[PDB]
């Protein structure tokens, strides 16, 4: 296990902004959250709830690709992204699953069926973000130089969009393929506050549900707050149990002479 | 027009076997061959059918996933590769050549036939 | 291929110019059911299927919803709610061999009528009488397929006809590009934008994937053109009181 020191922010929309603070309300990875340190030196089946954060770190090309899906087998639609050459591949047919997809070994696709898009075309961290909403598939990525021994560095830099895919296939599964470091984290609807510089790159960010000071910063729309007292939110108590008290008597209502009557 | 069939002897269950027959003589108006199966206690059955003009092959549900048929236009050859052999395939295999009259009724030429046996 | 083995091709995720399709050549038959030929380019659907087959001139009329005949009941069926077009033209030059062309065949009878958009490829001998036949053709038992009498001297009712049927967001055809103007306030419409103002140059530096640009109070002030990747500014032409 490890935490996440302010890592995993990305550009929400395709809008250029300069020297302005903004508030966005979509899915992110909450700051200082527990992640899983999977080690393969192995590849389990993990679920897919609204988004996934991925990262890896290796001096050799151990990481190959991913095998998405919902009910992964040879009976429904799927998705497959691998890099076995200088090219990538995309498919929406697959339907050739197995119990050990470890793969010039290519023992993954035993069969094939009705296929779709053919986008076959063209240490250090390599972080990725996957989300599937509105019937479209979007991915994000970035690569940065890094030197570390255990988990992760400090600082941050945002991720930029790469591709899009009008798949339309529901996804409720997730796997991985190797040939070191392999982390997993989940997404959640939150509210943030991002700062842009003159050239147009995210350079700082603060959360809204981490600490009271962050709440004050978000409500004042600034990164520095002067001394005083401020009104931030409201407080109320939620119920615990339920009571459904109802009358005592029991007798079935006579509808036969109403609905199944003989003569009207 | 003369149908001569070659190949097909005694095989073991689970093995493979290929049969080929040649058609020589008058040129056929319709490009359509086929393979037939006559069980010793039953009648003639359908194994495969290939046209070549459309390059589409038809197989019955009994042997849809096991029997494959191929044709050679240049050599006037046709082939039937048999895989995953079972005891139910023991029968005599025939070759069929289809021709048409001036009106359009399809004819059929019956070959000599080759005996195929599947025994352990 | 023949009508009994009609080929089907799927079209998706590409740009189709429907208007140019009719202008490529001359078609004797062009009937669209539920589709306006004038607004053929003004459509945006998902699935496109192009089914094609060869029949004679007199069998052309059977390719329509609610039609009956040998071809309509045993070779190709169109659903009553068909939403597409029927295109046909004579093929007596390239698709007609000299003297009883026997390559094309058709089905004459079956045990039941064909469902819409269904293809029959079985060559099982049809039993037309109480006398059984086991893989042998003869009395009361004939082949399900018969050869076409395609002859160059035959009439137009028997002359071969290749028919293409189009059955219907990733399939649409865009158009209407235009040049650019400067230093004069006009009405503009980029991809998904509308507004009035004057366009000049700018010194801003964008990022390799950004298109628009917004100042405070959510108002556009910078646009990138999708033809030459040149930045632009937007200011409104003058207004004031009197
Ligand atoms: C990025 O900003 C720096 C100053 O912060 C500036 O010198 C540089 O030219 C900018 N890069 C551009 C505009 O591409």
Numbering used by the authors:
A (entry chain A): 28 to 68, 80 to 141, 155 to 173, 187 to 243, 263 to 347
B (entry chain D): 2 to 121
C (entry chain C): 348 to 515, 522 to 595
Quote the authors verbatim.
Here we report the discovery of a neutralizing nanobody named VHH60, which was directly produced from an engineering nanobody library based on a commercialized nanobody within a very short period. From this effort, we identified a nanobody named VHH60, derived from caplacizumab (a VHH targeting von Willebrand factor, approved by EMA in 2018 and later by the FDA in 2019) specific to the RBD, which binds to the RBD with single-digit nanomolar affinity. VHH60 effectively blocks the entry of both wild-type viruses and variants, protecting host cells and mice from viral infection.
To further investigate the mechanism of VHH60 inhibitory effect on not only SARS-CoV-2 WT but also other variants, the single-particle cryo-electron microscopy (cryo-EM) structures was determined to illustrate the nanobody VHH60 in complex with the prefusion-stabilized SARS-CoV-2 WT variant S trimer. We refined the conformation to an overall resolution of 3.79 Å. This image represents a single VHH60 bound to a single up RBD, while the down RBDs remains in an apo form. Purified SARS-CoV-2 S protein was diluted to a concentration of 0.8 mg/mL in PBS, pH 7.4, and was incubated with nanobody VHH60 at a molar ratio of 1:3.6. Then these five classes were used as 3D volume templates for heterogeneous refinement with all selected particles, with 207,363 particles converged into a “1-up” conformation, the up RBD bound with VHH60 while the down RBDs remained in an apo form. Next, these particle sets were used to perform non-uniform refinement, yielding a resolution of 3.79 Å. Then the model was manually built in Coot 0.9 with the guidance of the cryo-EM electron density maps, and the overall real-space refinements were performed using Phenix 1.20.
